[PDB]
Structure formats: structure tokens, C-alpha cells
Write a protein that binds this ligand. Structure first.
Ligand code: ZN
Ligand code: ZN
Ligand code: ZN
Length: 279
DNA sequence: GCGTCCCGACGACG
DNA sequence: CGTCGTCGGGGACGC
């Protein structure tokens, strides 16, 4: 069993997301529990929480099929203590918000040294940031997403994820989410079944599939090793459809939210359908 | 320096 | 009432 969806919109309320997900026949969906470009959001009201749950229950979307993503503003590895504290508070908020909504996963970006600390220093801060949050919450698993490696942003090498995990105490609540566009941009080839098997065997060796808690199926507008984060619709980009079919036929990707973040939402229904047809 | 990439609340419009 | 535009304000790309 595979859960295929997209990062649908939460405009007008979290329940709408589940509704939007159902409208395109998704068996999985991602969302923002609050605007990802602002520091503060009004606390969830029991009304919003209830409606969201009613919506999810109506369509049978279980916690294992939902992959909320945190704020863009958060840097769990910020070189400046004050800004790091702020990022930490926010991240804690996002995780507490997931607990209220009965969501067990939280997709977030690793962090950036902003040319002001070393890589180790930045990674250890991320580890610390996670321990701190898993310490102030329950039931929510921190899912680290690999990145394209733009600017001073870490997490483009599988080794960064493995190092961040080594520093986490409660390994039961830490995981990873692989974004095809990001891995490709980082330098992990996927343009053929052969490369996919190779790129994922590597992932298996340095991180291990027991930590995979989600996927981001994006094609790339950016190029191999460009370390540029620019997505594209499935098959219209530099990666191609082969990789996505390959993924759909590999059982190592079962029981997790496979989320589309392709550039044209209007064709998400077709993309979701095509992906399913690949199994 | 500015438009655009990795959006949801809400006020102004019509 | 539906829809659009602006604000918010981290880190970046590429011109
Ligand atoms: Zn992401
Ligand atoms: Zn992604
Ligand atoms: Zn991306």
C-alpha cells in the first residue's frame, strides 16, 4: 500500500485541506498548519481542531497519511543564539499544533549556517533543536527533509541527515523525507532506474529506510548537481518519469505519505492518477 | 535592487 | 458572497 497525494491548500481552514485532498482522489496529503511565511498564527481553536478531525474521519485520512510541513522561517541551526531560540520556539509550536490535530509527523527543513558557523556546529544545533522539541511534545515524529543545498543550507547530503540523527536522543521520533528534486539538485542521479537503485542503495547505507517517513515526488526544472531548488511537473523536468515509475514499483516506499509539490496544482489529479497507474 | 521560488489571513473590490 | 491584492519578512536564485 502506497499513499499518494499532494501538498494541498489550507486556505480557509485545515479541514478544507482534507477536502481539497479528497477532491483530487489523494490517499495522502501535506499541508501547513499555519502560514509558513509569518512567525505568529492564532492558536488553533477547538472548533478548527474538531472540524479538521471530522473532515479527516469522513474521508478516512489517517495520521499515517498526513505530512504537515513547518514554517519557512525556522532555522534549527541558526548561528545566532537569539534567532535560534526563536526558531526553536516556533518549531515547538508547530509540533504542539500537530499533537492537537492528532498528526504524528512533522516535515521540516534542517537549517543553515548562514556563513557564520561551521557545518558541524550547525548540524549539532539541529540535533539539539530536535531533542529539545521532542522533549516538549509527545507523539509527533520530527521528519527531516533533504535539501537542494542552496546558499548556506545544509541537508543536501545523506550524511547530514545521518549526523543529525546520531545526535537525536529519542530515535523513535526522528525520521526523514526524501524530495526527488532536492536529491537530484544535490547531485544524486535518478534519471534512470540504474541510478535510482544506486542513489537509494547509498541512502540505505548512510541513513537506512527505517527512517524514511515520507517522500516529495517532484521533477526538476533545475539541473543535476545545480544545488538549485526549482521543481517541475512529473516528466516535464530534467529528472523524467522513469524515476517516479521506478519509485511507484519499489515496495521500500510503502506506508508513507508520497507528496507532490509539482509546479502546476491544476494537474495534480492527473499526476496522482498517473502515479497510481504505475504500480 | 527587484521579481520569483520554496502561501493563508483578511481587508478592499465589485 | 466570491475573488483579488497585500502583508508577512527566512533564505535564495538569477538577472
Ligand atoms: Zn520542504
Ligand atoms: Zn520538498
Ligand atoms: Zn523544493
Amino acid at each position: 500500500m502506497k499513499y499518494i497525494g499532494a501538498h494541498v491548500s489550507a486556505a480557509g481552514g485545515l479541514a478544507n485541506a482534507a477536502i481539497r485532498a479528497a477532491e483530487i482522489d489523494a490517499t495522502a496529503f501535506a499541508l501547513f498548519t499555519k502560514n509558513q511565511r509569518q512567525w505568529r498564527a492564532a492558536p488553533l481553536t477547538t472548533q478548527t481542531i474538531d472540524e479538521f478531525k471530522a473532515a479527516c474521519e469522513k474521508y478516512h485520512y489517517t495520521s499515517a497519511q498526513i505530512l504537515p510541513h513547518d514554517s519557512y522561517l525556522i532555522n534549527l541551526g541558526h548561528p545566532v543564539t537569539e534567532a535560534l531560540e526563536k526558531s526553536r520556539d516556533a518549531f515547538i509550536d508547530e509540533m504542539q499544533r500537530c499533537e492537537q490535530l492528532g498528526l504524528s509527523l512533522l516535515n521540516f527543513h534542517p537549517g543553515s549556517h548562514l556563513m557564520q558557523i561551521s557545518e558541524e556546529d550547525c548540524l549539532a544545533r539541529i540535533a539539539e533543536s530536535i531533542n529539545i522539541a521532542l522533549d516538549k511534545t509527545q507523539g509527533v515524529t520530527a521528519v527531516i527533509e533533504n535539501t537542494a543545498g542552496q546558499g548556506s543550507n545544509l541537508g543536501f547530503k545523506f550524511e547530514h541527515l545521518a549526523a543529525i540523527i546520531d545526535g537525536v536522543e529519542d530515535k523513535s521520533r526522528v525520521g526523514v523525507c526524501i524530495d526527488t528534486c532536492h536529491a537530484f539538485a544535490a547531485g544524486y542521479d535518478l534519471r534512470t532506474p540504474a541510478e535510482c537503485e544506486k542513489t537509494f542503495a547509498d541512502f540505505a547505507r548512510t541513513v537506512g529506510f527505517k527512517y524514511l517517513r515520507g517522500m516529495h515526488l517532484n521533477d526538476a526544472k533545475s539541473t543535476f548537481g545545480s544545488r538549485v531548488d526549482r521543481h517541475h511537473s512529473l516528466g516535464e523536468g530534467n529528472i523524467g518519469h522513469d524515476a517516479f515509475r521506478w519509485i511507484m514499483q519499489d515496495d521500500r516506499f510503502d506506508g508513507i505519505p508520497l507528496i507532490l509539490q509539482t509546479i502546476n496544482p491544476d494537474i495534480w489529479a492527473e499526476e496522482i492518477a498517473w502515479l497510481k497507474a504505475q504500480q
